[PDB]
RNA sequence: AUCCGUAACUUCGGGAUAAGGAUUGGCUCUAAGGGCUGGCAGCCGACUUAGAACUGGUGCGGACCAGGGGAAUCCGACUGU
RNA sequence: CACGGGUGACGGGGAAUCAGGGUUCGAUUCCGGAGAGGGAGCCUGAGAAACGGCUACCACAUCCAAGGAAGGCAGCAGGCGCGCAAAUUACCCACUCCCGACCCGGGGAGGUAGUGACGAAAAAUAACAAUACAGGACUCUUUCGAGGCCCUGUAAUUGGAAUGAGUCCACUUUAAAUCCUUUAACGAGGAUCCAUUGGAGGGCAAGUCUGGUGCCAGCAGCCGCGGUAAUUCCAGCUCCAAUAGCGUAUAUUAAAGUUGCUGCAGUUAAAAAGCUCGUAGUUGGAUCUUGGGAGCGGCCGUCCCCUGCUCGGCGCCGGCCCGAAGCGUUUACUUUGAAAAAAUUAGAGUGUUCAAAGCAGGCCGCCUGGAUACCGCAGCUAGGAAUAAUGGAAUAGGACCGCGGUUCUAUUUUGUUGGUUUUCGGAACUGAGGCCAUGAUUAAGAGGGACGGCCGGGGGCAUUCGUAUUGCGCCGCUAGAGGUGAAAUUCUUGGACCGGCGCAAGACGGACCAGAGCGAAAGCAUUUGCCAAGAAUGUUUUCAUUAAUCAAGAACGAAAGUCGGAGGUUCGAAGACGAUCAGAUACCGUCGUAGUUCCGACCAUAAACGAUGCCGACUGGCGAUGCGGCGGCGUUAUUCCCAUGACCCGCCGGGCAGCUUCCGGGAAACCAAAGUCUUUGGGUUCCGGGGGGAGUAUGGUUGCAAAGCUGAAACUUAAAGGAAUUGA
RNA sequence: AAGACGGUCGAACUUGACUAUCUAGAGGAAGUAAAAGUCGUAACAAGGUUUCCGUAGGUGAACCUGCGGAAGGAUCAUUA
RNA sequence: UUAAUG
């Protein structure tokens, strides 16, 4: 079941059994590394770099080549944000559907989705206050919300 | 139960001390509504001064006239239709006479034929109704 | 969601016990399914499992037998003293011949009357006969 | 004037200084509320507020200034003419 | 769940009902607290805010010569009042102790008697023999009948044999008595020395007996009985239940699986908030220690070992063994031990003649007992680490084995007196190293997010189209047109209705339209454009438990209704008229206001329904449909082929569904959930406890109002209701 | 020793406020229980206008009507 | 079309 939706969808990946790395990939982990440091460096979601790696480089798992995962990776060396990417697109989200509130105050369905949307904001807000990555002053404030985007 | 955890109890003891309120024979033991309505007060046995004798006329299909004492009370003065048990026995009691009243055995609620009756009568001025009726003593003259 | 991974196996294994299977997957591998399914074999009411390792939650395979009436769960994980197991196999066990209460306890996941023998109260785990 | 406290009703804004109480004099103190110069030091200027003691034949907003109040009914909303 | 309120609440050990769980009570002899009519204050004294101590005020009350004095029985007896409700104005310090100057005195504490059917234990009201009879195991007899080695009962038939209950001398008992036990003498055949309390239709054991009454009297806790043949009233006889006890009234427990932790239900009997978010509360995926060895018995069972770092002797040749002390994440959980007042409960022993009880007692001075178990919850202690929490090291301010400097310093030491600086050790600060296998479990058919192609009467804004309507203008011909079961109210030579061409504004979005889609629900259907969002699928993406249900709170919320503006074509509450009817203030027809339409604010109510809360797991198939993805004979379009649309056959995820049967459930109708329920426990909210009164009164709160939320009691009733069968 | 000023504890009296219980009351408006009462027939069969829910108006009265739902409806169905 | 009551 979904959070926030009545679906009951079954569809995410399937990671295979073997973690070793397979023989066609000649690229190194130093590599794949620098690539990761090449591709943070343009600017780009760890999403979308793994999304980048497995279709241009062949590469799907970076755990399973290097030692650790991509943010983890980005956090090493200085290159990850100040907040984590997901919560970062809820807020963009959000800011977006209450510039639509705010030119059409009448849609009543997207107050709700609206609400939906700062429920979920809150939920990891709170998360990410517990895991401590997130300043315990830190809130949520949609006056200023819109500058970050 | 329905929530089953492991630390459940407060819940639990305030969802059922909330739904004990909701049982008829709880509810009419544990408020003083029903103590105040009652006209013993919480006790077995009343005694009453006679004022006047009353003819109640029978419900359905039972046809009849049952022979009830309007009974007024010493220890409230509240008036109460006592109902006279035997045959023949409403001769005995007299006017202007301390009579004691009990219940009928459904705990404050009318019985049978008669319509608003719950108490009925026992003794007669010390001298008890069932020996009065039996033959075995003799009202004080 | 899934809260009690145990109850959810051996209703599954009722569930297959009731329909007739000769084995049944069920879906997680937990240390307690997979010893409460070894105090089922020490007594011989199904027969010989075995457990499929993936690097997750992994399947568990057990192969049976129609000598399993019921297969139950207690839950929550209750206090059990020594005092208080006879109430509790008067008042879950069809009788006091057979029927076993498995409950884990300070030497490890065993059966009430070991329990007796080594002289420990625990946790319940629940009931099989 | 200061300290309490203030009801029914209501258009929740009011009623309201509602209603009902206590104190108020003089004298002698204490505490708090600041500037200029070189968490400290020096030099100065202001009226208030709070508290205590003593005392006068219980007298003290001692003259003057200065709301009687409460509960209801009818009419007009009101301010105004 | 503070604070406030109520208690017909002193608290506890404990009492009753009890399967296991609980529920109710505890003023009451033991422990602790409070008080002496209501408060307040004080002397004395170690100890009092004491009241059989004082000092004032209030209530009550005594004497008086009118100035004045004196009181505190919720102590023992007793009196009044209050009551449904409760004892003698007795005897004694002899038992138990208490106090005093104490072996001597005092004790209404206490002991013993008087009342006592609160209650508990034991327990008389007869038994035997002989006659008549009525029968049963034998013998005999076809049955009828008969003999008694064996019987069993009945009958105001007879007979002695035995005893109390009472009477009463005498001991004994006791401070003196009373009662019990003992004991002479009396004392029983209708052993009149007479056992009652309720009932006899069913529940519930026990007369279709007799007489009277005739829906009257009355019986009846429930159903019911009595209306002139009463198995139910009133009397007699008989029988039944208990037996010195029984009935009645009230509180309470089991019954009640009708309060449900064990262990109730929520589609139709009473029930799931209209729906969604959401904090407390509750529940939370998997994963970190396996095994090996020695000894015994017949591959199995069982016992032992697999922690680290000051003081002394099986002692031995700086090292080894053993014992003692101290520190080694924290708990929840389990076991033992201590500390847990007695009285009570279970229970050892013991012939109070038995028993309830008591702690006694038994042997020819002695022998002995007066145990033990339990004592919830919390606190202490020592074993265990399976389960649930809890952290380590991730800007490496991390451990480990060592080093070099700065400051301070217990002091051993220079034969004994003094300073300074070092070797050597402890505290703090600080620099260069060596090493960890150096350190981050997996990525849940959990969840959040990114991305790809979609998909959809989802939402908002703007635009556009379609007809029909009603009204107007012009033209043509007309006496009818509307409307009804039938007529009329209505229009109509002032041209109604109809046909044709235009104009008008407001609606509505047919047929396509389906047991099809989307949306949390309410709901959503002309075309195009813009904006934000969403399910499912695809993914060898990312985060790594971030999750589920949710008091308080918050968003949306049909239609109707309310407040403002705009517009009002049709329909149409109210209202008017014509029909029908005995009557219509209704159904029918003709008009017709509010409303129905748009925008901005309220209202928060529906048969808001799937009368079925949300998430998760499992247990049968069949043909489909919708979306997305994948595979595979072949037709049809682009046309000139690859590759994409339309078809055909399959596979998978869930989305609304349907059909099928002994999964299984339920009272059944029925349901693949309403199943996995007495073989009862996956997690979490709301809600019901017979029917009315009643969603009513009152209190609070919201709203402009209508009304919305919360929400009783008194009183009344023995039924109300659900499913299904057969008649009508 | 008596007595006096002051302080403290503070009984008690009066006034005012709050809160709890009981109760009088003209008149108004409900429920329950009889009945050999009056008027109509709302509902149960398509109860003769199918029934019921929500929301408004009106009428002696059950009730009637408007708008939106539901079948607990008399339809599980109506054809290219 | 009308058709209410016991
Ligand atoms: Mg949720
Ligand atoms: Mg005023
Ligand atoms: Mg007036
Ligand atoms: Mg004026
Ligand atoms: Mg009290
Ligand atoms: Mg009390
Ligand atoms: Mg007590
Ligand atoms: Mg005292
Ligand atoms: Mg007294
Ligand atoms: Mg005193
Ligand atoms: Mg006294
Ligand atoms: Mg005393
Ligand atoms: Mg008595
Ligand atoms: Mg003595
Ligand atoms: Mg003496
Ligand atoms: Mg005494
Ligand atoms: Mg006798
Ligand atoms: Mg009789
Ligand atoms: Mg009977
Ligand atoms: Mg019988
Ligand atoms: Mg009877
Ligand atoms: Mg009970
Ligand atoms: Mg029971
Ligand atoms: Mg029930
Ligand atoms: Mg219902
Ligand atoms: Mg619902
Ligand atoms: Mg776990
Ligand atoms: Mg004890
Ligand atoms: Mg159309
Ligand atoms: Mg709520
Ligand atoms: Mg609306
Ligand atoms: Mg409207
Ligand atoms: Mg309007
Ligand atoms: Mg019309
Ligand atoms: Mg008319
Ligand atoms: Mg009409
Ligand atoms: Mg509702
Ligand atoms: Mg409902
Ligand atoms: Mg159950
Ligand atoms: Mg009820
Ligand atoms: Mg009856
Ligand atoms: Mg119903
Ligand atoms: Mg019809
Ligand atoms: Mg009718
Ligand atoms: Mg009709
Ligand atoms: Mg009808
Ligand atoms: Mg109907
Ligand atoms: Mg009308």
């Given at each position: 079941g979904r959070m926030h939706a009545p679906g009951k969808?079954?569809?995410?990946?399937?990671?295979?059994?073997?973690?070793?790395?397979?023989?066609?990939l000649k690229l190194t982990s130093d590599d794949?590394?620098?690539?990761?440091?090449?591709?943070?460096?343009?600017?780009?979601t760890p999403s979308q770099i793994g999304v980048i790696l497995r279709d241009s480089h062949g590469v799907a798992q970076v755990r399973f080549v290097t030692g650790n995962k991509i943010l983890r990776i980005l956090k090493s060396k200085?290159?990850?944000?100040?907040?984590p990417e997901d919560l970062?697109?809820?807020?963009?989200?959000a800011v977006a559907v209450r510039k639509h509130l705010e030119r059409n105050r009448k849609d009543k369905d997207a107050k709700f989705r609206l609400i939906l949307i700062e429920s979920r904001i809150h939920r990891l807000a709170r998360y990410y206050k517990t895991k401590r990555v997130l300043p315990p002053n830190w809130k949520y404030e949609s006056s200023t919300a819109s500058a970050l985007v | 139960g329905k929530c089953r955890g492991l630390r459940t109890a407060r819940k639990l003891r305030s969802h059922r001390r909330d739904q004990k309120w909701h049982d008829k024979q709880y509810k009419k033991a544990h408020?003083?509504?029903?103590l105040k309505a009652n006209p013993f007060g919480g006790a077995s046995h009343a005694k009453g001064i006679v004022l006047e004798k009353v003819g109640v006329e029978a419900k359905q299909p039972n046809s009849a006239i049952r022979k009830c004492v309007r009974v007024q009370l010493i220890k409230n003065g509240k008036k109460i239709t006592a109902?006279?048990?035997?045959?023949?026995?409403?001769?005995?009691?007299e006017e202007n006479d301390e009579v004691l009243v009990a219940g009928f055995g459904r705990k404050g609620h009318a019985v049978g034929?008669?319509?608003?009756?719950?108490?009925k009568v026992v003794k007669v001025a010390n001298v008890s109704l069932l020996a009065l009726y039996k033959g075995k003593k003799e009202r004080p003259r | 969601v899934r809260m009690n991974?145990?109850?959810?196996?051996?209703?599954?294994?009722?569930?297959?016990?009731?329909?007739?299977?000769?084995?049944?997957?069920?879906?997680?591998?937990?240390?307690?399914?997979?010893?409460?399914?070894?105090?089922?074999?020490?007594?011989?009411?199904?027969?010989?499992?075995?457990?499929?390792?993936?690097?997750?939650?992994?399947?568990?395979?057990?192969?049976?037998?129609?000598?399993?009436?019921?297969?139950?769960?207690?839950?929550?994980?209750?206090?059990?003293?020594?005092?208080?197991?006879?109430?509790?196999?008067?008042?879950?066990?069809?009788?006091?011949?057979?029927?076993?209460?498995?409950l884990t306890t300070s030497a490890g996941i065993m059966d009430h009357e070991e329990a007796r023998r080594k002289h420990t109260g625990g946790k319940i785990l629940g009931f099989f006969f």
């Open positions: 969808g079954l569809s995410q990946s399937a990671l295979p059994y073997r973690r070793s790395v397979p023989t066609w794949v590394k620098e690539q990761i440091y090449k591709l943070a460096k343009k600017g780009l200085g290159l990850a944000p100040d907040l970062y697109h809820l807020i963009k989200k | 408020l003083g509504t029903a109902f006279v048990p035997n045959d023949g026995c409403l001769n005995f009691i034929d008669i319509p608003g009756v719950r108490f | 991974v145990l109850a959810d196996a051996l209703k599954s294994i009722n569930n297959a016990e009731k329909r007739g299977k000769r084995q049944v997957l069920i879906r997680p591998c937990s240390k307690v399914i997979v010893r409460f399914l070894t105090v089922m074999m020490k007594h011989g009411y199904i027969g010989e499992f075995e457990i499929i390792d993936d690097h997750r939650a992994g399947k568990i395979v057990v192969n049976l037998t129609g000598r399993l009436n019921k297969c139950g769960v207690i839950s929550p994980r209750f206090d059990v003293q020594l005092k208080d197991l006879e109430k509790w196999q008067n008042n879950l066990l069809p009788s006091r011949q057979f029927g076993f209460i498995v």
